[PDB]
Amino acid sequence: YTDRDRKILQLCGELYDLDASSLQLKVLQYLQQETRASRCCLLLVSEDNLQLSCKVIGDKVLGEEVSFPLTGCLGQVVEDKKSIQLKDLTSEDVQQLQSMLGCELQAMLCVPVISRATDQVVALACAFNKLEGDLFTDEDEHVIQHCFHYTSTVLTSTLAFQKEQKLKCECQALLQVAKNLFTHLDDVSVLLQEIITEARNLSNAEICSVFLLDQNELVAKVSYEIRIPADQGIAGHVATTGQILNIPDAYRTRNILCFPIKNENQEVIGVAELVNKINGPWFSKFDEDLATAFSIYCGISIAHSLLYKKVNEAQYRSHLANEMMMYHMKVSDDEYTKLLHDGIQPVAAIDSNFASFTYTPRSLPEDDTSMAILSMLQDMNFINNYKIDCPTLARFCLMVKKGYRDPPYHNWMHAFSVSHFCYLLYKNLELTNYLEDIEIFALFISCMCHDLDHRGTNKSVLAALYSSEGSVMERHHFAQAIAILNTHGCNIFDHFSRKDYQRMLDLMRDIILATDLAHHLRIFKDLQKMAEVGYDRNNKQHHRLLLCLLMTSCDLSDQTKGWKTTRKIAELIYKEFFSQGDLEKAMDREKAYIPELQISFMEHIAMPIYKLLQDLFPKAAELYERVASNREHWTKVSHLVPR
Amino acid sequence: YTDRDRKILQLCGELYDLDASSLQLKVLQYLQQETRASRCCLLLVSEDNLQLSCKVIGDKVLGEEVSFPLTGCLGQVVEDKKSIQLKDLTSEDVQQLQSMLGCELQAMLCVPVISRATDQVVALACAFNKLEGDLFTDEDEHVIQHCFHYTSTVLTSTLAFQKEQKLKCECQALLQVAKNLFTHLDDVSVLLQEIITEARNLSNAEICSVFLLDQNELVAKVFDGGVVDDESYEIRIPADQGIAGHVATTGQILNIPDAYAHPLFSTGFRTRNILCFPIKNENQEVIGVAELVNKINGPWFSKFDEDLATAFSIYCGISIAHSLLYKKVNEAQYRSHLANEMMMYHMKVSDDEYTKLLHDGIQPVAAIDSNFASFTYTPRSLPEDDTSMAILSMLQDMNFINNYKIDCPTLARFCLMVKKGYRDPPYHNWMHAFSVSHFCYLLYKNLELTNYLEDIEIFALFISCMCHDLDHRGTNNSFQVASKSVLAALYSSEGSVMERHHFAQAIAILNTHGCNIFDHFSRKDYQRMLDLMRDIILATDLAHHLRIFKDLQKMAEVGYDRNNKQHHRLLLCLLMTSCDLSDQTKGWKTTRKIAELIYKEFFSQGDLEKAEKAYIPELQISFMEHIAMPIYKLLQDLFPKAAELYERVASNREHWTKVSH
Ligand SMILES: [Mg+2]
Ligand SMILES: [Mg+2]
Ligand SMILES: [Zn+2]
Ligand SMILES: [Zn+2]
């Protein structure tokens, strides 16, 4: 009648609430009337069309939303969109109803809410206990229909907008939490805590504990440490099965929501359980997809967080050891900043003759040396050509210097004068034409390190000092230079592609082990044919013997100096060569040999080298003749020797 | 009024659409009627109540929602909730509506939709060009009102719902990216692409470029996957240059409508707009910059593509920061092993080798041999393939595997690596090492070392016995004659140079993968367990032995404090020395067979190659007399069960005396 169309229009006038719940009251309360039903309520059919939900019964807006599987007798309504009555009952729907309900069920009118839009039962409108003459009519059903035909659109939309308002909210939630667990990849311990806090507020649990699978067992240290079998109890099952587990009653216990962690694959890597719901009977079957959502970020973060500990742990042990090879070398910040005072200086300002074969590196001050190295590499365009952080480079140089010990001869001062030669060779013989830049770098870096941590060596041959060992010692020096590169902010080969970096290691390993006179002798016959048959810049092999050769030549480079200079150094070579050890455990008439020993060295070792050098580099002849000369001075000092 | 209250109920009967737009149509096409207005449309007041929007004009649902600032003439309606008419509009306003709807404007009825809940003008109901007889009445405005009073709620809620559904998947959008990025914190190269792919979809740019601040300059590596064998092109622009430079320098976003119109902006491209934004870390230090070029389907960058950029830019900052932080480590690590690999001549214990050794049966010592533990045992007697086991069985029986929870797959790998780790001289071979370790082992039993030293020491001792001569070669050299030489120059000292080498070698193993049997020691143990090995192995220097010898006496003279930390050092040195020359305690034909190896080594090779056996008695006699004996006399001067050893050296000393004759 136009009369129902009075009360209805009156209704919709009133349904102006923003809350789908408060709208439901008005609609219910109006039916509670027009059907003489004691109590009325709507069971909203789930999005997945597989569950019923009821948040408002009668004139009471339930504290917690009641829900339950979309059964059969109550689940057939949804299907044929036909209205049923109590006499059409399972004892379940009758149990789960009068339970959710709260009383005697004598009557019941189920009229399906079918949308004119989607066109499907969206809600199950229920009327119970007909006030009095328990008689729900074929018209009691009509009034219901009629009501929703107008009222349903809005009801549903205010309800839906409220679902997206929630959905939108559990993301900003997660967006937040994602950004909080990721700010602690530093500390699996802090992170592990975050996961707990966050996991507790997200679901609103009384308590969360988190277990990290440790092989065949769960360890929720969460402060003490708690081991236990990986397959035992709740945690063990969930961990074993890799699938969530929800508990209504567990039997201040009650409920437990427990979920897996799993990694990139689906390998459960940990497990977490929440106990007891706050403001609730259990865990919203929504508190599961939300927990699963979260649980992705827990697995992502734990996985990397642990994988980062493993490194830091290891890498630490790696240096605990490496500082052992260091005699703990002290290169203080003040030390390096002091040397590195924005002025690397230029070689030109070092000295006029600083670059001519007639220079005597030992002639400089010892505190003015590490500079020269910076200005020597600088001018060889190596700092910029390779983008060498200076704070690092100046730290290397100071460390390599503090790495030399103190014998007469085998001291840092020998390493500098050996490197300075290398430097000379570079300029004077223009090495850029014969070898790649990375070689001239390694050759020089080697000169700087070849005798590191040396302590001095000692019917004998000089090429047993200034020379060989079993390569044992050459391997040491190389090994020591490595410890330096392995020291923080000292690795000057920081940015080299792994490609360069490796070869930068091999190069240095070869060159330094090349400083073994016993090795030189071995390749010597190879160093000749190359001298005989040019020197292929394309020949990878020829590069090797050149680099050996140059090294050797820098190493005994003191043979090419002035007589009075070689005279002075020979003192140091021989002061060393003749002393100490384990002999300690219990010379003038044996310094008489210093001449023959010396003469023999030059003739047999030293000259055959400078001969070669000038047999490849004619610019290198001045060195040979210098060696051949000094040889003759030595020859005279030998005349004074008896026979 | 029952008649409108007929038409209205009839309207809501119809307003069952799910699309807020299809609902606006029915409401609008009802009003196009009831007011005899040529066309109708609603202008929805923005959430921020600063903008009017219209997606439906007449019976046409617009392909692109129209919008515009909530003006003054149209904005006073929102304020006093008073409905107005064209004659209340400024020509300015007027020209906009005409232009917005595309027709003449003679009439117009604007009725404010006030919320029955919020109670605020939510929309502006517009009636245009009165269908002939241009006259919009005081009741034409009433039918409008009335209509909404019922129709407005549902209208407003369907609208709302649609905005939340749009907001929710714009959040989920962020979640996917956030997760896509946070799962690439290994190589900052892959993640760095993601940041691009992702950020480019996020704002919908034609192109994205990411730059990382490398000190005082912006850097950007080339890719898509060319191949970084030997890296792959790196762009550097001064950190304060152009757009990125500014944004990097000022650390604040930068939006451009037209880029040519910029002080800071040609080979085909021709760029329109640019959105550039900073990266910054936990503090607010710009760590990187990213620019998006050209908007797809748009003039520029929504002032919403900015907050979105900022939002994302957070995750970028998070991941980039950690990603790089991890590379730094991993580098420092590859750069170690690469070196470490080399001080090893690339040793490789195979996944098969180890499992073959480790066949669930460590076997006990007891089943090795009857008195495999008695002072008369000749370790050298056993088979070479059967040694590594013995080790495993000896550490087993001393209770070290479990007491320290040594992973066996790690431990067995270690043992096979320190073995493959020895070389091949006559005397300084793995066999010397096993026999030397074995002697340690014996000592532990027979003297019951558990009463004098801490279990960690007996552990370092043994482990040193295992490596003390790693990677050894043959010592000998030149001989000041061969009669003018001392055995305490082989079976002894060096300059400590070599002992430092064996200690260091053993470190390269521990530093090799799955061999660090000291994996789980507290940083405290791990350290001390390294000093221990360092000291002990350096103690295998005869020159060092002699050096502390006088201190090895007062201890032997004055008891042996187990509380003396100093007594434990000497005691451990002594023990090592004793295991080193332990073959002096073996049986005459045993020691005789050994000395051959010692003496075969002690006499050969070197640089002599590049560049007298009759003394084997005095040489050896002199050894025992000066070095070897005073040791075993001290071993028995502290351990009386160690007497059997002394006498066995003193005796062997005597046979040697006879071979001398
Ligand atoms: Mg040398
Ligand atoms: Mg040794
Ligand atoms: Zn040298
Ligand atoms: Zn030994």
CSV table of C-alpha atoms and ligand atoms in Angstrom, one decimal, chain B residues 427-428 432 436 468-469 491 540 576 580, ligand 4:
chain,number,residue,atom,x,y,z
B,427,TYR,CA,111.5,-35.0,7.0
B,428,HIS,CA,109.1,-32.0,7.1
B,432,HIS,CA,106.1,-35.7,10.9
B,436,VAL,CA,104.1,-35.0,16.4
B,468,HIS,CA,103.6,-26.2,13.1
B,469,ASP,CA,105.3,-27.2,9.8
B,491,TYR,CA,114.9,-29.3,13.6
B,540,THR,CA,108.6,-24.4,17.7
B,576,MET,CA,105.5,-28.4,22.0
B,580,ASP,CA,108.6,-31.8,18.0
C,4,ZN,ZN,108.4,-30.0,13.7
